[PDB]
Amino acid sequence: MGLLHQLNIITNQRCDNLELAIDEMWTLVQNSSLNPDEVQVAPGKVFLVDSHDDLRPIQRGGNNFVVSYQEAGLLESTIDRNTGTG
């Protein structure tokens, strides 16, 4: 029961963090030419700006999801290996 509850908790926490770790975001700095209503994604769109660094994608940090996956796998293996359903 403890292992099952821990597995559920790990899955829920990983889902909470993953829901936030997926979205792609951009950052727009004040300028004289590039307005926020003109920054849209289009194939081959050319941005008429005054500086190349006005619009910049947000760099997300290293995520600790591999350890969560490893712990979930270890918990599932431990549950199967204790129960006897190999």
Partner: protein, 216 residues
């Protein structure tokens, strides 16, 4: 509101640069301050797409296919229709592609820029009732006052930014003081940066990289 007068702004600039306030543009320093204030107003207008400059208007006059918008900083979008029926946006084409098709009267489908302050629309309207159905999304120029008692067509909360710019230019011209010019320029740039960062034309909730262009 818009209650600041040209003589008041000139007197503010003169007091800031160290000259006595005047009652008319009679002496050389007053004339120079008036010219500098007009230049600073134009400079601030060029600095940003201000909400008091962005508007939707109709064409002042029409030649066969060329609508003249007079003086405008730039033209962003062109739309056809009415408020009770909706507005459909026209597609922009370069001049060579625009000239590749026959120019005939009808309902506008494409538009391009012709020389200064003119937009060519194909097909073009031939009657006034069809000409008044075209909306132009333009950025206006700042209206420069001409005499002492003229009211500046700018909200009173940008008068300090205009004053800082005019004081920078007046330190360059009248005082010939690079250090004072740099100080006034620092003030102007700081407030301009904060204003452009805080007052944008879209909300933070509406700021998005996705725009819906509908499944052609």
């Amino acid at each position: 509101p818009k209650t600041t007068t040209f003589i008041q702004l000139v007197n503010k600039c003169l007091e800031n640069i160290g000259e006595r306030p005047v009652i008319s543009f009679n002496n050389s320093v007053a004339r120079k301050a008036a010219d500098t204030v007009r230049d600073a107003i134009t400079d601030v207008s060029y600095s940003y797409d201000w909400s008091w400059l962005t508007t939707s208007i109709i064409a002042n006059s029409w030649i066969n296919e060329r609508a003249d918008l007079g003086d405008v900083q730039s033209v962003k979008h062109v739309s056809y229709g009415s408020s009770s029926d909706g507005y459909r946006e026209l597609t922009f084409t370069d001049e060579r592609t625009f000239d590749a098709a026959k120019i005939y009267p009808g309902v506008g489908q494409v538009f391009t820029f012709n020389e200064y302050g003119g937009v060519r629309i194909n097909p073009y309207p031939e009657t006034v009732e069809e000409q008044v159905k075209y909306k132009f999304y333009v950025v206006k120029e700042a209206t420069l006052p001409s005499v002492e008692i003229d009211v500046i067509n700018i909200p009173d909360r940008f008068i300090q930014l205009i004053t800082y710019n005019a004081c920078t230019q007046l330190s360059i011209s009248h005082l010939d003081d690079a250090q004072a010019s740099q100080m006034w320029n620092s003030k102007y740039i700081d407030q301009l940066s904060r204003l452009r960062a805080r007052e944008r034309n879209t909300t933070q909730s509406g700021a998005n990289m996705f725009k819906f262009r509908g499944t052609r």
